[PDB]
Amino acid sequence: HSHGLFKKLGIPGPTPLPFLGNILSYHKGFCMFDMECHKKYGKVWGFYDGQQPVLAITDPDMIKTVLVKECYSVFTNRRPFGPVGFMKSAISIAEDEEWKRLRSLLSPTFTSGKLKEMVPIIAQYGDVLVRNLRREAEPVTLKDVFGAYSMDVITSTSFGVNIDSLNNPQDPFPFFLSITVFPFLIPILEVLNICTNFLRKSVKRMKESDFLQLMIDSSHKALSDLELVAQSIIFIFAGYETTSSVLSFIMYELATHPDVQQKLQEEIDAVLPNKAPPTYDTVLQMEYLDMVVNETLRLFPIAMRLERVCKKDVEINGMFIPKGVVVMIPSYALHRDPKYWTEPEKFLPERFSKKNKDNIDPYIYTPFGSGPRNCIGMRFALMNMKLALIRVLQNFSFKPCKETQIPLKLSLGGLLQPEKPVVLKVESR
């Protein structure tokens, strides 16, 4: 069918098989597929997820045109996910005009000062972590401890609840993607009644009569109860998973690089002497801390792939793109590209130093994306993580163990998840 598209465009790529397209080459994960295609075909290439044509671009100017220059008019939406039901109205899933409203509706949640009156609330949960951390079983599953914290902070910044997750919490947060081959079955399930339930109303209950309160405020600017919940489901998952997952990845690199973990712990002692309470302005000046979370986001991107659906015919940077093609930016392949990073498989936070910050193109390293559809909780995630990295390193040191996977191997599937959990030996001072 559409498998002759890239042939007619003069665009190279792996020859697709009938119906399946190129999905068979995902047997080592799409990152390995993206990197190998990046080396065999160059700056641009096309392939097929089933019968869906995907155009991969690695040129920075062209990437900037897709994510920024032609976002509103052409590349407004990502690949349509489903079946979801009412979750179609979630901001990270909605399209065009409905998303444009949801973005403007939820933008003021993480402004400059909106995060400033969060630290007094976030700081309290930090101690709860150091208390549950101070346990002396003289490794530790870094994910659960970080997940307990990250759930406690996003459920508190969005709504009013604290949860010492030493006991059981209620947040219940895969291997199913046949649609990517055969997605034409999504409209089948949109009427087959396919989707949350416990949380689909547990959130809905919230009346409180602030993310929750800056929404019940609900002129072409309304918000149903399900809409309230649909945004809450996204914010809770993103605040729990993304934070905790990256925090554990950061700790793995700190344990396997004692010089970096030690030089960072020196940074926290100086700027915050006598283990002073982390404020909103002390985080924003620890420079080496910023480099450490930045270099970890390079080697372990949560996206791995950035994508935009072409909505109408375009010619960008001297190349025509038809409607309905998914334009993909292989962030993982670009973050590991030896053409932009020397020894790219190595953990070296000096890439983001004061002098080396200029050599980085902001359209090759895009851990939060860019443009109007970038990560809306980027600054909340950076602050929530850095507030965590500061207090946990002011008190503890982290060290490998016999139950630690070294070198850490990432699930060769479709998730910035490790094969084995990060279990590090925690030591105290």
Ligand X SMILES: O=C(N[C@H](CS[C@H](Cc1ccccc1)C(=O)NCCCc1cccnc1)Cc1cccc2ccccc12)c1cccnc1
Q: Binding site: which residues?
A: 375
Q: Please, what is the Cα angle at 95 between 94 and 98, to 5 degrees?
A: 75
Side chain identity at residue 182, one-letter code: F
Q: Applying CB under 6 A, does 379 fall inside the site for ligand X?
A: no
Annotated binding site for heme: 375
Q: How far apart are CA 262 and CA 259, in angstroms?
A: 5
Q: Applying CB under 6 A, does 118 fall inside the site for ligand X?
A: no
Single out the residue of 122, 251, 291, 303 in contact with ligand X (rule: CB under 6 A). Answer: 303
Q: Quote the tokens at residue 90.
A: 């979630």
**Helix residue spans in 287-406 (DSSP H):** 287-299, 331-335, 378-395
Shortest Å distance, C-beta 280 to ligand X: 22
Shortest Å distance, C-beta 231 to a copy of itself: 19
Q: Applying CB under 6 A, does 376 fall inside the site for ligand HEM?
A: yes
Site string for ligand HEM, 378-407 (x = CB under 6 A): --xx--------------------------
Question: What Cα–Cα distance (Å) separates residue 31 from each residue in 66, 316, 329, 333, 369?
Answer: 21, 25, 11, 6, 17
Q: How far apart are CA 41 and CA 228, in angstroms?
A: 45
Site for ligand HEM in 257-276 (CB under 6 A): none
Q: Applying CB under 6 A, does 330 fall inside the site for ligand HEM?
A: no
Q: How far apart are CA 166 and CA 114, in angstroms?
A: 29
Single out the residue of 43, 131, 312, 420 in contact with a copy of itself (rule: CB under 8 A). Answer: 312
Question: Which residues in 209-224 are b (16+ Cβ under 10 Å) and which e?
Answer: eebbeebeeeeeeebe
Site string for a copy of itself, 48-87 (x = CB under 8 A): ---x------------------------------------
Decide whether 182 or 427 has the Cβ nearer to a copy of itself: 182
Decide whether 130 or 185 has the Cβ nearer to a copy of itself: 185
Terminus-to-terminus CA distance in the chain, angstroms?
A: 65
Site for ligand HEM in 355-374 (CB under 6 A): 367-369, 373-374
Partner that binds at residue 164, options ligand X, a copy of itself, ligand HEM, none, CB closer than 5 to 8 Å by kind = none
Q: With 0-12 CB in 10 A as exposed, 13-18 as middle and 19+ as buried, what is 107?
A: exposed
Shortest Å distance, C-beta 270 to ligand X: 32
Q: Applying CB under 6 A, does 84 fall inside the site for ligand HEM?
A: no
Q: Applying CB under 6 A, does 155 fall inside the site for ligand X?
A: no
Collapse the DSSP code of 204 into the 3-class scheme (helix H, G, I; strand E, B; otherwise coil) and give the result: coil
Helices (H) and strands (E) in the chain, counts: 17, 9
Check if the beta carbon of residue 127 is closer than 8 Å to that of residue 386: no
Q: Applying CB under 6 A, does 377 fall inside the site for ligand HEM?
A: yes
List the beta bridge partners of residue 315. 320
Decide whether 6 or 99 has the Cβ nearer to ligand HEM: 99
**Helix residue spans in 82-141 (DSSP H):** 96-106, 119-133
Site for ligand X in 69-98 (CB under 6 A): 78-79, 81, 90, 92-93
Under the rule (CB under 6 A), what is the footprint of ligand X?
Answer: 78-79, 81, 90, 92-93, 180, 233-234, 237-238, 242, 302-303, 375
Under the rule (CB under 8 A), what is the footprint of a copy of itself?
Answer: 1, 19, 51, 96-98, 182-185, 187-188, 190-191, 220, 312-313, 320, 323
